[PDB]
Amino acid sequence: GLIESIACIQKGLPCMEHSDCCRGVCEALFCQ
Numbered sequence: 001g002l003i004e005s006i007a008c009i010q011k012g013l014p015c016m017e018h019s020d021c022c023r024g025v026c027e028a029l030f031c032q
Contacts, residue, residue: 001019001022001024002022004017004019004020005017005020008020008021008022008031009021009022009026009031010022010031011023011031011032012030012031013030013031014029014030014031015029015030015031016029
């Protein structure tokens with residue numbers, strides 16, 4: 001979640017894990 005890969009990955013940015021995205025949802029490799 002928070003601070004998983006240089007902080008959490010904010011909405012609209014690419015992620016490769018649900019834990020990367022700040023609100024725990026990564027879809028299409030982007031933080032929803």
